[PDB]
Amino acid sequence: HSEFVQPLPFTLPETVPLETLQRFWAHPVRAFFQMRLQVNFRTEDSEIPDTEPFILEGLSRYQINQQLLNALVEQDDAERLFRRFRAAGDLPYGAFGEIFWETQCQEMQQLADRVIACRQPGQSMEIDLACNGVQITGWLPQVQPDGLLRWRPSLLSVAQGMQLWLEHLVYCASGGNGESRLFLRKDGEWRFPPLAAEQALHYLSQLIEGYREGMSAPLLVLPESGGAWLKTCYDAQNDAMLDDDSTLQKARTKFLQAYEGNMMVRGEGDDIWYQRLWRQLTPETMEAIVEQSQRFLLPLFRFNQ
């Protein structure tokens, strides 16, 4: 069996939308599979459970938290949404659904006290950019004069930081002097300061080069494990990467922790897109992923504050 990675001919088109870049930098291996060769591994949907939901975990809990955060960002009645979710049966019966709604309302109110502390009314604006002879057309929703404001009921992850960094690059390139902020759970915050037009266009050209590199060859840029390796190796005080053996062992420990998780958290390596390329994580491909993450994910932790 020959290797799946092969140099393919690919010509970069004139008009590349922002949605294509967002779908690329959300998952680069999936974007190499389902868009270049159009191979999307469609797994079958989950079967109907045999009993009523006694607890809330997974996609249903995330959707409940998302609707509760979208309701509390406008200071709406949480009790009406409680009756709406209880009338659909998505909540546990009786008092346990009330306890779940109370602790989720406490957590979403704690998040909303940080979200609407610096919230201004902003409208969606248009994006028309010309970078390296490539046209980027798109729309940015809820653009406030303070900058970019996004909120999601999730954990501190590198993929959301990459998405916020891409939105900040596509926002600062056409006017828009201001910071970009994203508020996650457990006091997690992604912040990017405003930059000049030259640095924003240079980093946007770097992301465009990464996009045109990911369509020819599978761009082995792991967001979570590569970001963990980088933030173990990066030093924000001196703006330089350490090269001692202790940091090189702790970064390998963080990479093995984020790639293959424990028996309670699904790791990044347990995915249908990564098992097709390699069956076992070789150290050569590990060093390749490390080099690609050092090449691409470095302005994520360089401009983080």
Partner: protein
């Protein structure tokens, strides 16, 4: 204790045999079986010799029972040969032959034992319980037929969900808050009580009363909190205790924390500042008021609702599970033990035990360490002190490692306290004497090394034939036990595991690199053997550390297998690839599923191949055409022909065998294919098997057939095996990297030291935690004894100063909390230097130590060899000609008979009505009504049906006018079945021209096409009847859908005969009748005896038209002779 001789053991009463590790236990069972069969021993013998169906042997594992049955059969055959020859080559067989005086009767008894070996009573525990429940079902109360279920977790989860519905739903907020703080849902409660729901229900120490509910306990704890709140509100505003140096002056602020705490009693959790108001803690840092003592009495026991909910769950869920299995009629594995214990618990069932004493008046129970208390209660109910019945408990208390499954060593200690005699096996026949001396040196450092009084350790003796076993290295003779002490003061868990896995992989590659050059050898006397990869085995305890060993060993180019891998084949990526392939076969029109299935690792294509397949439309057309051919094979031939054609046309099996690491993937693909073919025969639809495969992917449940198998047997691999899966096996070289890793038991479930009963303490008392940790440490010591005694030549140990405590440098290490350090440090806490001195203190010729070296030079050397040329034989000709035994069908107003429903089933119903009815007697209307009731038709059709039947019977069907009523019972013969032979290949062109030469109805009717049929032809003639010395044939055709008027004349009937091709059937009927009348009647003429063939169309018979409905035909009497000559040869 005493030594055990198999020819001097008294088989009276109860005896307890303690067979040590490596001893000939399976040989001793066969020796006692031969002793019970032949009746040997003299004064210590049985009072009468017993047969094969009276000797009961009980062993837990079914494969162990099969192996023991085969070994006992081989021993019976060998003793029969040695008794017929009066000589043998074995000393125990020599003493067995010397004990008997007669030889012919003993040889005849051994021959009868060999012939009755199929009916041997060597069963398992659950099998013996099921056989006794089905045999004596009256005294026990068991159904005759029941359905055993393999998995009981679904009904258990359903009963737990029912308990959570009927107990946790009507609770108010102040109770449901505490219930949510204890468990999130019923899944956490089931995960807590799943070790107690199965097996014997334990006795809860200090249970709640039966009338106390959750609300009463909640109100009691609320009143207990409110009393302390009242006593704090009354005694507030004063301070009389002396201020100490440890006591800071901010305690009044803590009193402010107690000032805001008393608002409502809706909460359940008190403040931590009450811990500052304890009289036992303030004195150590003068308490005179009893408010501090009331606070200390409040904090003496934890305020928890958990114990009452656990008690109600253990009272409700087991009862609901038993009620559901009694409603469905199902049974379980432990349910057989519970049913036999409840049958022996009754008063009449004791007599049933006497029936068991009538059934087998002996018992030899193997593996008595794996004995549930229900099993020992049954065996004490049957075979306690009754005469003429013997009980032989053959076991080992040092091997009881199945406490997680339901076994218990306190039951063995109760059994040892109950019985009087004890016997032990001194000689060990497995390992080298160096390893035996190492085991007897390590486990005899202190007294009672297994920490229990009823489990004594004795020094075993090595074998005389195996005293020359030496594992020799390149340098010199390697010692038996080599404790690789990892150097350092204090280390973690993952770092210690990684370093010892690297040291073990380095030792494996050093033994394999020097073993392939003739340096490291296994020497028995002067005989030598090189160490292959199958000799070295790593003994682990968990799956995560097994994967750690496999990852640390595959880095140095060393392949390794996991024998204890119980993972399902449906949870791998290959099952998802097979699901995608089946979805692409079932739906090849949509290109998305086919593109997702072609890019899998099973096909093995590059991205350039997928890109050129997406670009070229003709190659995708070829792929869609061959997948449609695969779908046609899958709909016609099944699962495995389609999978074999896919693996042969794409040649993916050769590509997976050429790829390194793809042989395991190919064996998993073959096992998934075998399971899909096994499940595809039980399903009719094609999408149902795909839904079953997707369900079994979504269901990770482990069955005995759906587990992963061994990938290869020819290539030697390093066999990683758990300690429980290594019981009773044998390995030359054993590496134990994680024998110092220990885990502390948190739950309080112990056994009492006096009553020997399972006591579950739901409250967090420290005495119950210590008594459970003592049993956990005894289980770890038993696991250590099991893992140490499996090596033959050399065992290696990984020792390190492991600290489970979170403090890095506390001055003491936790190796005394493990099993190895309790024997090394003699049960005393020491340091890393103390551990090193305790290791270096016990240094002999067999026991040595070395430091753990981290270092790698080279992975391995492949040393491959060329493969010889091989070919496959090819069949020269066809396997068989077209031989098939076929029939004629294989070669091809408001109520009226016209309004009858036309179908195959009403046609067969009318055929059965014309078959069963007598032609002489008049038709009775109530009989027609009874036949319509039996058939299921409408009752309104009956009075028209009987007059239509009589109108058919009154109409004559002959050239002279002979009706059916004139035929007697001896003249008629209904449904004559004939077989007609033909030895020539039946050519349709040579037959149709011969038919058309004489038959006038073959003017039209273009000829049918059929293959060359050589063999037999079946046929079922409806009626044959004689009249005035002339034979006649009658057949029934009753479909007749297209006619309702009187248009069924002779021309329309001839057109129907030409269309449905009944001419060939009638010609074969004339040939069969001609051959029958030629064979039966002597001096037979075809023109004299045969009269013609009548076809009776039932819906065409009218009262006014005698010719309509009947069709009489006579052959030309020359076609029959030529057809007989053609069919004969």
């Amino acid at each position: 204790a005493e030594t055990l001789d198999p020819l001097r053991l008294p088989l009276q009463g109860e005896r307890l045999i303690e067979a040590s590790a490596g001893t000939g236990k399976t040989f001793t069972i066969a020796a006692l079986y031969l002793r019970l069969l032949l009746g040997l021993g003299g004064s210590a013998a049985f009072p009468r010799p017993l047969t094969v169906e009276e000797l009961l042997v009980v062993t837990f594992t079914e494969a162990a029972t099969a192996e023991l049955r085969g070994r006992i059969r081989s021993n019976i055959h060998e003793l029969r040969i040695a008794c017929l020859r009066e000589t043998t080559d074995n000393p125990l067989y020599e003493r067995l032959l010397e004990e008997i005086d007669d030889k012919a009767q003993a040889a005849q008894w051994l021959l009868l034992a060999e012939r009755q070996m199929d009916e041997a009573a060597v069963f398992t525990i659950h099998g013996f319980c099921q056989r006794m429940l089905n045999l004596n079902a009256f005294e026990s109360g068991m159904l005759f037929e029941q359905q055993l279920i393999e998995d009981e977790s679904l009904l258990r989860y359903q009963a737990c969900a029912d308990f959570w519905r009927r107990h946790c739903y009507p609770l108010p907020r102040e109770i449901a808050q505490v219930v949510f703080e204890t468990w999130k849902g019923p899944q956490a409660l089931l995960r807590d009580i799943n070790r107690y729901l199965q097996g014997e229900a334990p006795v809860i120490k200090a249970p709640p009363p039966d009338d106390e509910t959750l609300a009463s306990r909640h109100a009691q704890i609320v009143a207990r909190i409110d009393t302390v709140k009242q006593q704090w509100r009354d005694a507030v505003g004063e301070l009389d205790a002396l201020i100490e140096s440890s006591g800071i002056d901010r305690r009044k602020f803590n009193r402010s924390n107690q000032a805001k705490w008393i608002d409502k009693i809706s909460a359940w959790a008190e403040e931590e500042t009450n811990s500052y108001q304890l009289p036992e803690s303030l004195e150590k840092f003068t308490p005179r008021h009893p408010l501090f003592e009331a606070i200390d009495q409040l904090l003496a026991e934890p305020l928890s609702i958990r114990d009452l909910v656990i008690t109600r769950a253990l009272a409700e869920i087991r009862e609901t599970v038993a009620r559901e299995k009694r409603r469905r009629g199902e049974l379980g594995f432990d349910d057989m033990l519970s049913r036999l214990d409840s049958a022996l618990r009754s008063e009449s069932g004791e007599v049933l035990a006497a029936a068991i004493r009538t059934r087998f008046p002996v018992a030899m129970i193997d593996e008595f360490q794996d004995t549930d208390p229900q099993q020992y209660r049954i065996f004490r109910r049957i075979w306690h002190h009754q005469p003429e019945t013997a009980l032989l408990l053959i076991g080992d208390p040092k091997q009881a490692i199945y406490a997680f499954r339901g076994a218990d060593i306190f039951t063995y200690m109760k059994a040892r306290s109950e019985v009087h005699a004890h016997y032990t096996l001194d000689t060990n026949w497995r390992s080298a004497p160096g390893m035996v001396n190492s085991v007897n040196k390590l486990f005899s450092q202190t007294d009672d090394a297994f920490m229990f009084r009823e489990i004594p350790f004795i020094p075993v003796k090595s074998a005389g034939k195996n005293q020359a076993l030496r594992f020799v290295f390149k340098g010199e003779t390697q010692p038996a036990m080599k404790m690789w002490l990892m150097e350092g003061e204090s280390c973690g868990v993952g770092d210690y595991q990684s370093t010892m896995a690297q040291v073990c992989a380095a030792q494996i590659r050093d033994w394999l690199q020097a073993g392939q050059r003739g340096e490291a050898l296994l020497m028995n006397g002067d005989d030598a053997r090189p160490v292959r990869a199958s000799d070295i085995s790593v003994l682990v305890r968990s799956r995560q550390e097994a994967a750690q060993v496999r990852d640390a060993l595959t880095l140095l180019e060393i392949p390794s297998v996991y024998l204890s891998n119980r993972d399902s084949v449906f949870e791998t990526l290959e099952a998802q690839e097979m699901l995608w392939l089946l979805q692409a076969v079932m739906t090849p029109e949509r290109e998305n599923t086919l593109r997702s299935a072609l890019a899998t690792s099973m096909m093995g294509l590059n991205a350039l191949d997928i890109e050129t397949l997406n670009n070229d439309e003709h190659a995708w057309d070829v792929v869609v055409e061959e997948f449609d051919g695969y779908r046609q094979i899958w709909r016609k031939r099944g699962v495995m022909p389609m999978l074999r054609a896919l693996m042969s046309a794409r040649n993916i099996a050769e590509n997976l065998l050429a790829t390194a690491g793809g042989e395991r993937r190919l064996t998993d693909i073959l096992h998934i294919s075998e399971l899909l073919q096994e499940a595809g025969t039980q399903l009719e639809s094609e999408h149902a098997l795909v839904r079953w495969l997707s369900q079994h992917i979504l269901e990770p449940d482990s069955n005995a057939s759906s587990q992963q198998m061994r990938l290869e047997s020819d290539k030697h691999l390093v066999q990683i095996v758990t300690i429980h899966k290594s019981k009773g096996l044998e390995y030359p070289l054993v590496w134990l990297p994680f024998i110092t890793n220990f885990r502390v038991q948190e739950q309080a479930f112990y056994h009492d030291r006096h009553s020997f009963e399972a006591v579950l303490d739901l409250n967090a008392a420290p005495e119950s935690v210590d008594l459970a940790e003592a049993e956990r440490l005894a289980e770890d010591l038993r696991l250590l004894y099991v893992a140490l005694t499996r090596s033959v030549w050399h065992c290696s140990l990984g020792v390190a100063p492991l600290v489970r405590r979170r403090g890095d440098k506390k001055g003491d290490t936790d190796v005394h909390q493990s099993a190895l350090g309790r024997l090394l440090q003699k049960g005393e806490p020491q340091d890393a230097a103390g551990l090193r001195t305790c290791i270096e203190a016990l240094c002999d010729d067999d026991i040595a130590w070395q430091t753990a070296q981290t270092g790698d030079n080279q992975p391995w050397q492949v040393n491959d060899v060329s493969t010889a040329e091989l070919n496959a034989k090819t069949l020269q000709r066809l396997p068989g000609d077209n031989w098939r035994v076929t029939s004629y069908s294989g070669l091809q107003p408001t109520l009226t008979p016209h309004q009858f429903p036309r179908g195959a089933s009403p046609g067969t119903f009318l055929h059965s009505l014309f078959e069963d009815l007598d032609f002489t007697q008049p038709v009775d209307p109530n009989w027609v009504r009874e036949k319509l009731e039996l058939g299921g038709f409408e009752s309104q059709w009956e009075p028209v049906l009987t007059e239509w039947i009589t109108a058919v019977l009154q109409a004559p069907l002959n050239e002279t006018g002979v009706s059916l009523s004139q035929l007697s019972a001896r003249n008629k013969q209904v449904e004559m079945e004939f077989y007609l032979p033909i030895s020539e290949p039946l050519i349709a062109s040579q037959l149709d021209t011969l038919i058309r030469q004489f038959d006038p109805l073959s003017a039209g009717c273009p000829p049918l096409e059929f293959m060359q049929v050589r063999g037999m032809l079946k046929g079922f003639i409806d009626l044959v009847f004689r009249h005035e010395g002339r034979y006649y044939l009658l057949a029934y055709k009753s479909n007749w859908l297209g006619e309702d008027s009187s248009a069924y004349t002779q021309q329309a009937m001839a057109a129907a005969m030409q269309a449905h091709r009944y001419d060939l059937q009638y010609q074969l009927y004339t040939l069969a009748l001609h051959r029958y009348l030629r064979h039966r009647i002597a001096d037979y003429d075809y023109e004299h005896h045969f009269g013609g063939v009548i076809y009776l169309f039932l819906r065409g018979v009218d009262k006014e038209h005698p010719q309509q409905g009947i069709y009489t035909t006579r052959p030309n009497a020359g076609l029959i002779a030529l057809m007989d000559e053609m069919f004969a040869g």
